[PDB]
């Protein structure tokens, strides 16, 4: 197949920025390239076809260009409705292939830090010889977070399952992380910690077999 290599995979932008998104085809595809916009829960929408032609009704702040195998989409002055995911596609051959997408996202002017709530295992699980720590994370923007688990001070590799953040109704994010333990492990340590990193800042919660 022809590969379409898109970059960057995401970028955060202010209203009024000039944004350029790049896409390299693994081989010549002439000018047979289209750009699509997609928003959450909706279908793709065509913006640009044949590398540089604006589809009907698309605002002229959008432009496309080609240099050899390098395709570019430019938004001259980013407007609120432009925050979305963008995809390139080659339609030069069959199968047509798509880039992997670029997410253009609202920069959090005041960023919103997460609340973190951590619970130890329940008795009912312990009696069935099971254990789950529950780390619940809410009210954060932007919607990206990393979770690290500690046993005492040691990083815990195994048994971690973490959701992708999901948009709350207030347009901030929520996420959960679950650490599965044996009762043995839970009781063999003084503490387990859930450390949430958002925008470089860490919020840590600890619980103990107490």
């Amino acid at each position: 197949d022809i590969q379409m290599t898109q970059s960057p995979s995401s970028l955060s932008a202010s209203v009024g920025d000039r944004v350029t998104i790049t896409c390299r085809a693994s081989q010549d595809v002439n000018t047979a390239v289209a750009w699509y916009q997609q928003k959450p829960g909706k279908a793709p929408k065509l913006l640009i076809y044949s590398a540089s032609f604006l589809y009907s009704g698309v605002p002229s702040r959008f432009s496309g260009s080609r240099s050899g195998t390098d395709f570019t989409l430019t938004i001259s002055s980013l407007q609120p409705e432009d925050f979305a995911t963008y995809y390139c596609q080659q339609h030069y051959t069959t199968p047509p292939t798509f880039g992997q997408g670029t997410k253009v996202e609202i920069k959090g002017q005041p960023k919103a830090a997460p609340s973190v709530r951590l619970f130890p295992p329940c008795s009912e699980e312990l009696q069935a010889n099971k254990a789950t720590l529950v780390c619940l994370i809410s009210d954060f923007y932007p919607g990206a977070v990393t979770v690290a688990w500690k046993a005492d001070s040691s990083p815990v590799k195994a048994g971690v399952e973490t959701t992708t953040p999901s948009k709350q109704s207030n347009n901030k994010y929520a996420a959960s992380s679950y650490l599965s333990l044996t009762p043995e492990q839970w009781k063999s340590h003084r503490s387990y910690s859930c450390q949430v990193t958002h925008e470089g800042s860490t919020v840590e919660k600890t619980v103990a077999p107490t």
């Binding site: 047979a32 289209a34 699509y36 909706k42 279908a43 793709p44 929408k45 065509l46 076809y49 044949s50 589809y55 995809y87 596609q89 339609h91 069959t94 199968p95 047509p96 292939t97 798509f98 880039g99 992997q100 997408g101 709530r117 619970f119 329940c122 009912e124 699980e125 789950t132 529950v134 619940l136 809410s138 399952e161 973490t162 959701t163 992708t164 999901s166 929520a174 996420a175 959960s176 679950y178």
Partner: protein, 217 residues
């Protein structure tokens, strides 16, 4: 104007079969090529198949050849995707789209998409575990763990829906096992612990499961 409406998505098990429909209005599918394109959860776009309804000619991606059949009925202005021998990896939102027409090989109109989930997991009700908590004269967090269920969704209420302030039910994790877990938390007055009754009501209709757990501190 131009519209493409799809139907037929669902939950199915590997080896199973499903049929999607794509009904066109505001143009004639004879004038153009109709395509199916899919998007796996959290992923990009993958072309699946294409048909020229004027002559029946078809093309497929290799990942679906011998499994999926694209067809059209011009008298119904409708295209179809017959999906047999389904695999977990086919799990996606399936869109139909059209080419503009003539040389116009961009996809200018897309349907709204239809979800297809392929999983070998079978229905299982959740087990429900109370999560027990303290800042004196402040607030505490309690909750319920709703573990190992399939499929979505579950509903959670507290005190049969009387208790609303401070409630936060979180979206589920899909585990590597193929099962879901979620949690619901309430922030309550510390002064209320040991005295106020707090009950989470968990409802999983596919398993006909209704569980109430009292949360004690």
């Amino acid at each position: 104007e131009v519209q493409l409406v799809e139907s037929g998505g669902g939950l199915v098990q590997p080896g199973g079969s499903l049929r999607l429909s794509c009904a066109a209005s505001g143009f004639n599918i004879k004038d153009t090529y109709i395509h199916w394109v899919r998007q796996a959860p959290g992923k990009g776009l993958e072309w699946v198949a294409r048909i020229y309804p004027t002559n029946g000619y078809t093309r497929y991606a290799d990942s679906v050849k011998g499994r999926f059949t694209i067809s059209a009925d011009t008298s119904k202005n409708t295209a179809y995707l017959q999906m047999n021998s389904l695999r977990a990896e086919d799990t996606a939102v399936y869109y139909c789209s059209r080419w503009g027409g003539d040389g116009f090989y961009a996809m200018d109109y897309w349907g709204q998409g239809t979800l297809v989930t392929v999983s070998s997991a079978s229905t299982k009700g959740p087990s429900v575990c109370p999560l027990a908590p303290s800042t004196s004269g402040g607030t505490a967090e309690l909750g319920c763990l709703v573990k190992d269920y399939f499929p979505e969704p579950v509903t959670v209420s507290w005190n049969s829906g009387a208790l609303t302030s401070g409630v936060h039910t979180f979206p589920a994790v899909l585990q590597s096992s193929g099962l879901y877990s979620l949690s619901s938390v309430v922030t309550v007055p510390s002064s209320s612990l040991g005295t106020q009754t707090y009950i989470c009501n968990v409802n999983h209709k596919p398993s006909n499961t209704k569980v109430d757990k009292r949360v004690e501190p």
